[PDB]
Amino acid sequence: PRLIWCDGGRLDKPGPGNLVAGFRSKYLNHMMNIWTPENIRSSLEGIENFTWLRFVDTSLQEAYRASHTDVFARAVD
Amino acid sequence: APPIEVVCDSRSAVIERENIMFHPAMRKALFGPTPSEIKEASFGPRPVTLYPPRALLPAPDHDKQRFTNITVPSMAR
Amino acid sequence: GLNLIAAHSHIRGLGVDADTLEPRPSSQGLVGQEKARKAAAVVLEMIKQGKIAGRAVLIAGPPSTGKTAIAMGMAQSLGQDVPFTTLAASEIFSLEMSKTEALTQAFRKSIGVRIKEESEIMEGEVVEIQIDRSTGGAKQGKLTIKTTDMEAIYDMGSKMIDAMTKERVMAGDIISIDKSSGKITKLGRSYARSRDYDAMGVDTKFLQCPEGELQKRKEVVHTVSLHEIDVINSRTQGFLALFSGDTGEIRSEIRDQINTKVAEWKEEGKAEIVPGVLFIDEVHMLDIECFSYINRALESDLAPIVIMASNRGVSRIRGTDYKSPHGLPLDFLDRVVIINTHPYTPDELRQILSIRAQEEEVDLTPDALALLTKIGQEAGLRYASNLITTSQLIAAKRRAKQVGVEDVQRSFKLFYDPARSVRFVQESEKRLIGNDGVVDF
Amino acid sequence: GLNLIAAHSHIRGLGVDADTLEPRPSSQGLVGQEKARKAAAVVLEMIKQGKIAGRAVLIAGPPSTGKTAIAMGMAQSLGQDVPFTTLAASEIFSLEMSKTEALTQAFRKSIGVRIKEESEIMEGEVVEIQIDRSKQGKLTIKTTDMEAIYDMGSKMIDAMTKERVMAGDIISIDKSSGKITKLGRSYARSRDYDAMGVDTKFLQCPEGELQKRKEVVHTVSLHEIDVINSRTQGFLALFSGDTGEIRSEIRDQINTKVAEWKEEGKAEIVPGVLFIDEVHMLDIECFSYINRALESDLAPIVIMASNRGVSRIRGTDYKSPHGLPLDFLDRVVIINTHPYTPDELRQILSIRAQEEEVDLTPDALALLTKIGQEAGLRYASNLITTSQLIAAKRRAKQVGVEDVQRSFKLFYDPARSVRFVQESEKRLIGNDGVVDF
Amino acid sequence: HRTAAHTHIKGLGLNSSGIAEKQAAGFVGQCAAREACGVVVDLIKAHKMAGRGVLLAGGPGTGKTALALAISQELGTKIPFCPITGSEIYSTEVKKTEVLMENFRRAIGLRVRETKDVYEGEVTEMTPEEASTLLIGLKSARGQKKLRLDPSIYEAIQKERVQVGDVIYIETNTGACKRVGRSDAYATEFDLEAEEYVPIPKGEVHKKKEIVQDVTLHDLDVANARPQGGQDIISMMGQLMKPKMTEITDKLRMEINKVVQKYINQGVAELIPGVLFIDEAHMLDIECFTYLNKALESPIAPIVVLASNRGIATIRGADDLKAAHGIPPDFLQRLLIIPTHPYEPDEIRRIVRIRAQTEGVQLTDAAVDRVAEHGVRISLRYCLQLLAPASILARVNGRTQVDVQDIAEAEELFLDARRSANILTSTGESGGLHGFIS
Amino acid sequence: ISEVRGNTRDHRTAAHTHIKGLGLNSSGIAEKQAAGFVGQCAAREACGVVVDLIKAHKMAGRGVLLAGGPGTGKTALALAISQELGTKIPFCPITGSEIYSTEVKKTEVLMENFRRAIGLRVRETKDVYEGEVTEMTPEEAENPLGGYGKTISTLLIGLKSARGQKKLRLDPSIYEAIQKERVQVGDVIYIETNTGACKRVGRSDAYATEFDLEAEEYVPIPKGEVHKKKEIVQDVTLHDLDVANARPQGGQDIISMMGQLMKPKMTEITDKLRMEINKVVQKYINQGVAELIPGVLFIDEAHMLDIECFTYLNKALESPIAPIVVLASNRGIATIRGADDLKAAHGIPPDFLQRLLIIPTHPYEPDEIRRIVRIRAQTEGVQLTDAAVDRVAEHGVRISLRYCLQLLAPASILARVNGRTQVDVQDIAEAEELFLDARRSANILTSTGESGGLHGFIS
Ligand SMILES: Nc1ncnc2c1ncn2[C@@H]1O[C@H](COP(=O)(O)OP(=O)(O)O)[C@@H](O)[C@H]1O
Ligand SMILES: Nc1ncnc2c1ncn2[C@@H]1O[C@H](COP(=O)(O)OP(=O)(O)O)[C@@H](O)[C@H]1O
Ligand SMILES: Nc1ncnc2c1ncn2[C@@H]1O[C@H](COP(=O)(O)OP(=O)(O)O)[C@@H](O)[C@H]1O
């Protein structure tokens, strides 16, 4: 039906009725994420978790694009 | 067979089908650049990049019959 | 055409009365069993009520006493409304996923959601199509159609002309333009333009024009289970998984959120929950790791009623080593409620053989039916029900019409009943491989 | 704030004298286990020296005596410099990697590589992109204090184009590599738009000088270097877990290059501590690898705990002391522990009281000491919270004899639960049959 | 409103002074266990808990899980409650010491408040201002309104096929957009276009509502490990590229604790520690009571209510030791063990009355005594499963209330386990053609 | 960037640090107290014969067993052989509990370790033009083609190394490199000889300040030659050839750019591939280019291999290209792990045991433990008096060998904490009660640990 496939049966389509799917998308993919460059820049200076990021041939933008695309789009990159 | 699709009678279902099951970004990334894009990239004053930098389709490993199942009666037979 | 006569193609329902719940002794195929069919009638009438949880009814009984028969009667006496799901209990031991989760999906497959919403469709024969592709493109065009009553002209958008050259709508097709999406399902071909079709077969069906108005609203009713929604909301395009079994361990937060949105759909009146039936055939083939999950999946609001069938007596439980009645642990036998069956009296054997003979349309003399009842007293229903199909063919060897004693006595001569096969094994020990020895004459 | 009072919260280091190694009794949380704490202090002093490679120290003893307490004391009294690894033994039995490799990675985590360098980074807020379509350009960046105009030639204009940097972003350039990392937008341009996108996060302006150079001390492990060199974009594998049987030739190249870095003075190797909690869960197929991985130069000083007496070894069918094979017990050294006197039990319950900010009358403390002597530590420590909560229900400040007796009446110690089971056998599912009354 | 096995459980039914009262809130009797579970509920709400274990003894038929659902409805919808059986810990994609930590991270809750500013309405114009920022007029049935868009939300509008007069639904905060349909004023532009013609919304254009909404930390773990749902389009292959559960390392959890503590220190989110109810803990084997003895000692661990009904049994996975409850005494000293005693014959009748007035099945007092007779002499789970079939034998025979005759018929139509065992042994004597196959 | 620390470049003490070789004569007769060993004469003579067999290239699939009890020196002889052979001959010290994988069958990790144990030395040449580009100046042809514009016959490149610069005339079909790779003035390149297609390494360091922000890698000038005609020895194990032929490393498509992007999975290798690689390596040896060098596969703890592995080892040892298999077994009459039927010697099946040259290993005399203590003490640097040596030897004879070599580190720590420099009898008599052996631990475990109760162990 058009309820499940379009309106609010999908947990990813952020239509009205699926009021969770906007909030959950933003606060799991851009605010409370450990790969956003703001949440990397504060943890790069010693024993902490992104210590190694200075030495692998990447940058913050390399890591941030690499942690949200697919295996496909990362292969195209 | 073609893959199974969803018969849902909204416009959004048709748009999501033609954006997932076809998804022109992957098709452009797989087959290569438009010849118009080749012309605007090869007559310009400065070198510019291409988003499929070459045709990313893999070379088929069987010369006479590639990526199909169609059979022509072979000339010897 | 895919209606080949099986071992249960004669059961057309449970056969009991629906007013005083009396098991009338011969109706709709199920003949003879009385007390068990009344208890199955009570269970069936509390399934369609809906105001009960997932409970457990165990159809225990000896082999070939009509347990799959009662389950198939309850399956036929519900129609395609309340979801009945068969589960032979060896489909659970998979390798694509774990075992408890494979059981959870079989619980989720039997809780339907039934929603009813409308569409707008168009019947009718196409009189003619004109498309203004002149270098032009799909920009404007005229569509003239008709029913027996109506006749109309419509103008078309660009994303409709691209669906008209997509389905290649001729002058004479019987199409169904679903207006809300744009798909075109050609119901057939009109008879009156039979000359106008050259690229068709010599044998081609032709319809008549549709009758009635040309623009009508349909109230279609869909019913999908919770496992359907779970597999849909699991990947990018994930419904293919439930057609290919490639679904894996579905995370439990998805099932929790769908259990929340189904309740929010019910409270808004947009939906309706239909509890189905799950038939776990041969429930003794589960280890205790299964029963320690069925004891708690039969607790929630969303749980289908489980009907299950056991053959074994005092037997061992798989996984463990200690024996138990019916092959089930005692803390799980506290949950279930047991219906016991009985072996069949010989007149009931005779009329069951009569129903199985009338189902395959095989003529029998009454002497051959008496001999066949005498065989079925000593070798069970399955042996005689196969001797029927053998004896029809043996009568068809020598070009006869009705089977007789001279063909049942040949079918009893060639194909051994299993008692004489056990006697054959016991009297041919030294050549049949028992465990160690092979002797060659 | 994601930090709640657990069982191991009052132990702030090992609590011994650092000069002459004298375990004074009530120091840094730990109470009265003087010989084992002295031995752990000797172990810790040969850990921080870091010369002697690949010992093995087993901590035997009865349950509820303090074997993980001394381990957490050794973990707290090292600092963030020397690594430490809390691995219970059931973590090894995986379904994606075998037992040998998932126990090799436990050794590869506990050896750090320490390297000090200078980071030449540039924070800044973009003011105006000035592209001269003649190749050249000018970038104007500001902070809360300064503002400057830097030239650009050919290609980082194209990097700006690929990054789509608008006026108001917070860009960061690592000038030793040269790649733009857009950090987001500023709060001074939140008033500008009304319907924001998804990707935009707001930040404060950068503060201070543009060109920031700072000497930072990086400390990675060998396991980091092993997993990064596994596959191409393999750095996210150590967060995800999507790695498997790494080949031996990669680990050989990595150990050779770490030896080469130690020769050239770039790197300093810091050996650490692997802590294998509850080592009796390992089968013989794991001890046959531990007996070889304690031979190389790159092996951490392994500290392991155990509970069991003469028990069977998993994987085989013969009894052994401590659940360990004897060819492994010829290799380790063993520090035994001892049960506690009531004089130690009283002040351990006092420390658990002052950790949970629960006030106790002395009569309640004596009663709780008797309960701890008759039932153990883990039941006595679980009655402070319950007596505090029952005192909170009847609105009393100090807990008393009545609340502790109420908590003893409600919840059962494990000494009486066995008599409760053996008292009513006909209803508990023993092995075969249930009565169900 | 459909009846389950624990519909009549509403709460623990306590006093103000924490003393249980008999026949309160659905329970009948069972005083000390309800008092202890009330103390447990107060411990969960007190937020001074970083891993506590509570075991529930008592055989089958007694009310162990009724206490757990009483706790779950006593906490409310706010504090998370995760019930899992023991047998769910086994998988074929991850180790079984990782599904335990996945349940611990489903237990802890993180509540965030949001003020969602939604925009329903018909697009009036699509005007690119700068050469970038693109104004959109959203016409409602109450009035149009200008709206300035970021140059990244416009590339989410543009991926959707919004052209001139499509009604849209823009989230202002999260930047989420959906094309609802084409407005019915532009309906009959052509005559067989294919869109979903919907009317213009007869409300505001700017609806401002606030939503409190929860996130479990396991969802943070999954959303930070692998890309999920939105842009994960290669998962439609299925074989190797599906979202398979992966071994979430300790480093990822140790960083997600840092980020969540950062967003708690800004006063954005709130933290709520949950409850993990592991039922039938004998199915947990010794390769998980080793890992629980470590994982409960974290300063972040939630409370664990274990339930176990067995006596002195064999611990699974290590066949050469027996222990009480199927729990190793290495782990059993941690637990607070609560007893659960059986039921007296005068405390079964009240359960029959409450279970009868839960299902709506009314019956005379001469039948309550018979159901209590079957409750004493056979079992408690069986006598409660005759109230629902006998009502079906009541309204069919022209009655409304259940008498003795309907239950005397249902005891013959619906045999229990004991009489079925007697028929299975004694009546099914010889193993032959018409006998059971042991 | 990275700041160099000027500290002491010492090393760490392992359990086999003091071993430096076998310590033989020029005739093969062993000599006691030489190169780390103490005693153990016949085993060192037999291992010297094994070392001679390996360096003589006559071993083609032999097998050597090391018997003897635990803590007697089998792994010591293994590391002695590995340090005696050197570094240019391979040595792959796997264990028995390292063939069990979850991606491949366990009779395949054995074959991959055989291929790790075999080396191949290849001697070749390297002819490259090298350095930073100074000019890219074309030259007009003598006869231009009619119908076109420019016609360029020879392209000139000025390459400047860090020692000397050089002008270079090239064929004009270097242009397709230069346009595709974007080579400009100030970019170090290398031009090969077999094809001749230059590939840019990076912008030079002298032009690191012409701009300000536009940065990439700034590689320095190649501090070497401008025309390398340098020869290369190159060691590749046959495992590396099997992997590079089975799973190709660098491709240009989507799916091989997902294969190196997804995790590399060990896959089983079909035997036709190994047969072909052997047939071609034995051809390149006959041409006289590559040298085959067999190594040692020291399978430590050989009683962990079950009966399904020795069956594959019989096939693998009958191959014409195979290294030596030095097993290491320390069991007597043991049950073989696979088939729980036959109690065989050493955990080795009696069919496989006939292939093996069994070398014994004897226990140590009670006057050689003190010599091992002296060598281990002067290895760590821990010096100690003679009565302390006699007490450690007393603990070594009466308890264990591995236990008297572990009372040296806590004694040294307590010595330099108490305020001394050398270890006396008091420090060892104090450290003997902080670190109990297995014997007194089992005594406490049985005597004090009576039964499972409150203050008791869990049996
Ligand atoms: N009441 C009945 N009416 C008609 N056929 C029956 C009846 N009971 C049993 N049968 C027949 O007997 C056969 C055995 O029944 P079934 O339930 O399959 O045995 P089992 O319980 O061993 O599976 C079935 O093929 C069915 O056709
Ligand atoms: N010396 C001590 N002083 C204070 N508290 C202690 C001491 N020893 C043990 N404890 C406490 O007793 C508890 C049990 O110690 P633990 O090592 O967990 O026992 P087990 O070795 O049985 O696991 C720990 O929570 C610890 O806080
Ligand atoms: N105090 C009580 N009041 C009412 N019903 C109860 C009570 N205790 C138990 N029950 C009943 O017991 C049943 C649940 O038994 P359960 O606790 O699941 O046993 P177990 O935990 O051993 O599986 C429920 O049907 C519930 O009606």
Ligand SMILES: Nc1ncnc2c1ncn2[C@@H]1O[C@H](COP(=O)(O)OP(=O)(O)O)[C@@H](O)[C@H]1O
């Ligand atoms: N001949 C020897 N000379 C010096 N040290 C020895 C000798 N033999 C054995 N050792 C020492 O004994 C210790 C244990 O011997 P080990 O090699 O572990 O026996 P196994 O080979 O049976 O495992 C090693 O650390 C080694 O240093």
